[PDB]
Structures are given as C-alpha cells and as structure tokens.
Amino acid sequence: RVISAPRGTEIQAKNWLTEAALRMICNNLDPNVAEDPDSLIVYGGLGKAARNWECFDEIVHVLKLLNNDQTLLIQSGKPVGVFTTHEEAPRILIANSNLVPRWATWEHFNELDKKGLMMYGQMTAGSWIYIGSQGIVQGTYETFVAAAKKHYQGDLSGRWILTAGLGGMGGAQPLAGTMAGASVLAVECDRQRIEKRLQTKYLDRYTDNLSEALDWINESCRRKKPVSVAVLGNAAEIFPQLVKLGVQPSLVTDQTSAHDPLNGYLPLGWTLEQAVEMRKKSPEEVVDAAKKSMAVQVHAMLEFHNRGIPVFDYGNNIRQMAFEAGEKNAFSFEGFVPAYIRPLFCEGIGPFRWVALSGDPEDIYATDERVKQLIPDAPHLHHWLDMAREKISFQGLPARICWVGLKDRARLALAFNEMVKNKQVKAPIVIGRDHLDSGSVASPNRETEGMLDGSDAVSDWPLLNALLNCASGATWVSIHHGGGVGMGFSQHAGVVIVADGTEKAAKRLARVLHNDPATGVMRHADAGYQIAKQCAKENSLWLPMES
Numbered sequence: 001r002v003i004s005a006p007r008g009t010e011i012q013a014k015n016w017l018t019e020a021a022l023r024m025i026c027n028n029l030d031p032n033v034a035e036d037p038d039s040l041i042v043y044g045g046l047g048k049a050a051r052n053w054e055c056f057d058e059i060v061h062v063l064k065l066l067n068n069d070q071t072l073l074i075q076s077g078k079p080v081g082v083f084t085t086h087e088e089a090p091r092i093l094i095a096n097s098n099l100v101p102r103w104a105t106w107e108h109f110n111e112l113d114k115k116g117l118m119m120y121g122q123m124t125a126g127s128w129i130y131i132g133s134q135g136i137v138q139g140t141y142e143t144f145v146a147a148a149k150k151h152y153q154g155d156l157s158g159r160w161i162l163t164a165g166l167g168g169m170g171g172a173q174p175l176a177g178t179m180a181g182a183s184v185l186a187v188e189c190d191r192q193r194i195e196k197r198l199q200t201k202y203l204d205r206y207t208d209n210l211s212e213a214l215d216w217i218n219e220s221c222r223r224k225k226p227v228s229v230a231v232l233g234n235a236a237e238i239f240p241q242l243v244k245l246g247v248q249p250s251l252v253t254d255q256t257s258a259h260d261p262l263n264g265y266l267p268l269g270w271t272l273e274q275a276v277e278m279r280k281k282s283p284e285e286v287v288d289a290a291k292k293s294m295a296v297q298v299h300a301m302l303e304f305h306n307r308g309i310p311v312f313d314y315g316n317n318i319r320q321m322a323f324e325a326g327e328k329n330a331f332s333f334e335g336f337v338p339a340y341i342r343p344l345f346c347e348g349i350g351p352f353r354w355v356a357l358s359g360d361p362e363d364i365y366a367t368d369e370r371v372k373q374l375i376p377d378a379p380h381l382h383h384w385l386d387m388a389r390e391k392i393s394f395q396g397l398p399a400r401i402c403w404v405g406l407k408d409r410a411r412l413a414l415a416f417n418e419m420v421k422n423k424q425v426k427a428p429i430v431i432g433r434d435h436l437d438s439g440s441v442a443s444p445n446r447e448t449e450g451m452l453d454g455s456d457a458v459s460d461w462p463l464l465n466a467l468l469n470c471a472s473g474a475t476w477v478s479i480h481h482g483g484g485v486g487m488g489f490s491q492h493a494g495v496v497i498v499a500d501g502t503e504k505a506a507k508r509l510a511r512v513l514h515n516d517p518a519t520g521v522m523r524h525a526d527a528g529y530q531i532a533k534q535c536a537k538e539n540s541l542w543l544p545m546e547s
C-alpha cells in the first residue's frame with residue numbers, strides 16, 4: 001500500500017481538526033517522507049506511526065468518525081478507546097512506548113513487541129508531526145548560527161567549519177553550514193555515504209587528498225563563497241593532521257557514531273572491511289581500538305580548543321569515550337546543548353513547526369513572508385526562510401520549521417489563523433514541533449545533561465507539559481518514552497494544534513502557543529538560570545516560587 005495525506009479543501013472527517021489528524025498520520029507514511037512506510041516506520045529505525053496495519057486502518061476509521069467533543073486514546077500506536085470530553089479538549093491523546101522504569105529496556109520492549117504489545121514512538125513518528133529531513137537540517141543550521149552569534153557576531157563569511165560524519169544526522173552538516181555562511185570540511189570514512197550526499201545535492205565536492213581539500217576550502221573562504229567538501233578518511237587521522245598543519249577552522253565539532261564504538265566508529269588504521277570482520281571475531285578489541293582512536297581525535301580537538309578556536313561536542317558521547325580511553329582533558333570543551341541550545345531554551349526559543357494541510361507550497365511561502373513581516377529584525381531567521389525555499393525541498397505536505405521564542409509563538413500562530421480565515425492560505429495550518437523543546441523533554445544524557453541544579457533526570461516536567469497542553473486546548477497531545485536516546489533514557493511530550501481560522505481556535509492558539517514555551521522558561525528558571533528568570537519577568541509569567 002502507498003499512503004499520502006489527502007489534499008485540497010474537501011474533507012473526509014467531521015471537521016478540520018480531525019481531518020488534520022487524518023492528514024498528518026497519512027503524511028507520516030508518505031513514501032517521500034517515511035523511511036520504511038511498508039512497515040509503518042517513519043524514521044529512526046523503528047519509529048512507527050501506528051502499531052501495525054490493523055491499528056493504522058482503525059485509527060483512520062475512528063478519525064473520520066470522531067465528533068468535535070470526542071477524544072480518541074492512542075496507546076503505543078493502537079486506538080484503544082474513544083470517550084466523550086468536550087470541544088475545548090484535545091481530539092486525540094497519545095501515550096507511546098511508556099514502560100515502568102525497571103522494565104524500560106530494549107530487551108523488554110522487544111519481548112512486548114513480538115507479542116504485538118508495543119510500538120516505538122520515537123518523537124514525531126508516533127505523534128504525527130514528522131516532516132522529513134527539514135527537522136535535522138534546520139536544527140543543525142540553528143546550532144551553527146548560535147555558535148556564530150556567540151563567537152563571531154553572527155557572521156561566518158570567510159570562515160569554515162571542521163567536522164566529521166555524514167550519516168543520517170551528520171549528512172545535514174554541509175548544507176546547514178553553508179546555509180549559515182561558512183565553508184565546511186567534513187571527514188567521512190564511507191565513500192558510498194559521500195557519493196550519496198553528492199548525488200542528492202547535500203554536499204558540493206569530495207576528495208581523498210587533504211591538501212587538495214584545504215586548497216578548495218581556502219579558495220572558497222577567499223571568495224566568500226561557501227562550499228562543502230568531504231574528505232574521505234578517518235577523523236582520528238585527519239583531525240591530528242590538521243592540528244599539525246596549523247590550519248584555522250572557526251568551529252570544530254564531530255558527528256561520528258562515537259556513541260557506538262562497536263558498530264559505529266571506525267578505528268584508526270582500519271578499513272571498513274576489517275571492522276566488519278573484526279566485529280564478528282573480537283568485539284572487545286573493536287571497542288577498545290575505537291575508543292583509543294576517539295581519544296586521539298579528541299586530543300586534536302582539544303588542541304584547537306587550546307588555540308582559542310570554538311570546539312563543541314554534538315551529542316555523540318565522544319568526550320566520555322575518549323575520557324575512558326585515557327584523554328583526561330576530554331571535557332575541557334563544551335557540549336552543544338549547554339553552550340548553544342540551553343540558552344535559547346531559557347527564553348522559550350525552540351522548534352516551531354507548521355504544515356500546510358492544503359498540500360500547496362504557496363501556502364508555506366505565504367506564511368514564510370508573514371513570519372518575516374512579524375519578526376522584521378532577525379537576519380538569520382530571514383536568511384533561513386529565503387534559503388530554505390531554494391535549498392530545502394518539501395516532502396509530503398509542505399511544511400516549515402524555525403526557532404521561535406515565548407515572546408513570538410502565539411503572535412505567529414494567530415497570524416496564521418487569520419490567514420486561514422481570510423484565505424491567504426488555501427486550507428488550515430497544523431502547528432506543532434518535535435518533542436525537543438524547552439519544557440517538554442527530560443533527557444539526562446542530552447537535552448537536560450548538566451542542569452545547574454542537578455535536576456537532569458526529573459521527568460515531572462514533560463508530564464506537566466502534556467497535561468497543561470491538554471488543559472489549554474491543543475488538538476492532540478502526546479507523552480513518549482525513549483525517543484532518540486532509547487529505552488530508559490528520556491521522557492518527552494509533543495503538542496499539535498490546528499489553526500482552522502475560527503475564533504474558537506484563536507482562543508486555543510493564544511493559550512497553547514504561550515503556555516507550551518512558558519513551561520520551558522519555568523523549567524529553566526526553576527533550575528536556576530538567570531536568562532530564564534529574566535525571560536519569565538519580561539513575559540509576566542506567574543512562577544510562584546521565583547523571587
């Protein structure tokens with residue numbers, strides 16, 4: 001079967017709110033969107049839109065029948081019950097992959113999955129708001145722009161980024177970096193992955209000659225004309241060579257699969273084929289050689305850091321692996337979350353995502369221009385919107401992501417609702433986000449690692465986020481376990497609300513798009529961040545325990 005979101009202005013559901021849910025679950029399985037839709041897999045290996053095909057078919061059946069005062073419960077991708085609520089409550093409540101903590105393991109998940117009892121929601125797979133690769137590209141752009149703002153007055157022209165890994169997430173770095181105004185040198189050991197990124201226009205050039213790569217980079221930095229270059233090789237060899245050469249990248253990071261020393265990171269001096277064979281004969285030797293290689297790479301990263309260059313981790317655990325392998329100074333440079341993302345979270349600045357249910361790209365282009373009107377002094381935002389139009393291809397329903405703070409989300413949502421009402425877009429707009437927002441994630445090895453107060457693992461917050469978005473009038477609300485970092489390691493919440501042009505939706509939008517980022521300002525003010533405390537006061541939040 002081939003699934004895609006219905007289009008245009010005719011609806012099959014009883015109203016546009018449940019029509020939106022119908023379109024969004026189908027869009028998650030669009031062959032231009034999903035990684036393996038035949039198995040209902042949206043992204044992330046096992047992130048599914050529904051538990052199985054019987055469940056998918058029944059979800060579609062229920063969504064077309066739900067009245068505006070009925071609410072469907074989704075339990076790990078299964079439509080288990082419909083109950084009467086009211087028009088100002090969500091039409092769907094979703095809880096995916098949640099396991100009592102001592103059972104929150106892949107071993108138990110798999111046992112339950114084999115019995116037909118489980119589904120992995122990842123983040124946006126089980127909660128029907130996945131929009132393809134734009135999420136990763138935009139998020140990587142956001143990080144590079146945050147680094148540019150912090151270190152270079154927002155200007156990367158004539159500068160270049162050194163990184164490694166062109167995989168499922170790392171492959172976004174060339175495009176994100178050049179969109180951000182920098183040239184990019186990315187080390188990658190798999191030639192087939194390089195060739196794929198070349199074919200799909202995610203990468204400009206590659207070579208196995210490091211000197212040639214540098215001459216290309218320097219020529220582009222001279223011309224102030226960003227280029228992306230992949231060097232075929234091993235980051236544990238190339239990074240120390242670049243240190244020895246005295247070259248001057250303006251940002252250094254890494255997205256090798258360092259989190260997986262057995263199956264991910266290629267040891268120094270090994271071929272891909274040798275790694276394949278050694279994993280079958282001697283897994284412990286593979287792990288040891290990989291971690292020792294990571295220590296060599298991190299030692300080089302530290303030398304750039306010692307020379308005053310901004311160096312940051314990109315959430316792949318490479319510092320801890322290198323530390324364990326003997327690089328005792330591994331943590332002298334920061335992770336990208338505490339350095340760049342958490343300060344944005346402290347102002348409720350986070351992923352703001354919207355989807356044109358009409359299917360018409362002109363709907364998104366109209367909303368792009370409107371965002372630029374509403375936030376006129378934001379060059380990195382305007383540049384992103386302009387560059388996304390020509391560089392980012394829509395997948396399934398046209399959609400857009402940008403990062404928007406507590407001060408502005410509701411303004412944008414209400415403007416979108418007005419555009420639906422006055423026909424400046426052809427059909428209603430779905431507004432949501434991934435689950436990685438200021439108030440909606442507890443993930444002590446990633447987004448809440450190293451909180452000032454040590455509250456990394458407190459998961460009250462995403463549960464309150466979901467309950468409050470339910471209370472506030474979101475169209476569907478989701479509570480998920482284990483997205484990104486796997487079973488046992490995160491708890492997070494999603495929210496989607498439909499702007500259908502009505503005054504009733506306007507009231508809901510004004511609450512949800514304020515309250516949802518405000519919970520993140522609250523959460524970070526609670527942890528002690530003055531940036532968040534200041535933001536709370538600027539937005540007149542009622543935080544009873546805050547002075």
Ligand SMILES: NC(=O)c1ccc[n+]([C@@H]2O[C@H](COP(=O)([O-])OP(=O)(O)OC[C@H]3O[C@@H](n4cnc5c(N)ncnc54)[C@H](O)[C@@H]3O)[C@@H](O)[C@H]2O)c1
Pocket residue numbers: 164165166167168169170171187188189190193233234235236254255256257258259264265266267314315316317446
């Ligand atoms: N939000 C975040 O925290 C965030 C964002 C992006 C990436 N990451 C992390 O970055 C890592 C990469 O993610 P991915 O999805 O791209 O993984 P992936 O497994 O798809 O890609 C890793 C890439 O590294 C390459 N590689 C392995 N060893 C290498 C070496 N020695 N030298 C050069 N290249 C090498 C592999 O060939 C592969 O293409 C993961 O740990 C991921 O969690 C995190």
